[PDB]
Amino acid sequence: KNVTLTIRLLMHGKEVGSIIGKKGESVKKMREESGARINISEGNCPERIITLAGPTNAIFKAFAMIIDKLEE
Template structure:
């Protein structure tokens, strides 16, 4: 387990996640207790975009170790939700935990690597599935990066993605993706 901080990478970083309303509800928790606990334990700043949209942006900012802690708490919470939803179901195989990161398109090239070499390396070394969307998110210069796997695989994967993002900062201006309110026809990112 390489300590990211040793490479002088203990800088403040911002990672943005795309979530559905139900996932956001799970992260916020009753009366905001879950997100409060995540903020306190990870020491990361966790902001959630306002609530009229079916998709919301969760922004996590802090030193890299705070971000990893926040991510691990989110991944574990989602795993809990999956376990809870399976209690009464007949499904035998457990679906993986899935997180969607929003990454400036200018950084996606570095994340994919020459001929897909970098993303293949990340998949193989972490055991997580990683997919970079081919198209940009509507009205933005960002793409969705979908990570799925066990919470542990996801955390390892996020660490590697953070390293890539720190090594190759975005070029030019980034137009951030803003989810549309529910009144507009809903087109989900990633063509689901």
């Protein structure tokens, strides 16, 4: 019954663009406020992977915030 999970989102490169933010200030604020480990596959490859990992709830905040940005 693990309390840490890892979910991988599969994402287009323009989408990843806004998740990171100018100088990476979005995903930085997403790291601080969610408490989830967030990792973004490097290389401006157009089809990229986002790895959220952490306590269920940290996962879920980082996800809310990622959705909240794609709809922004």
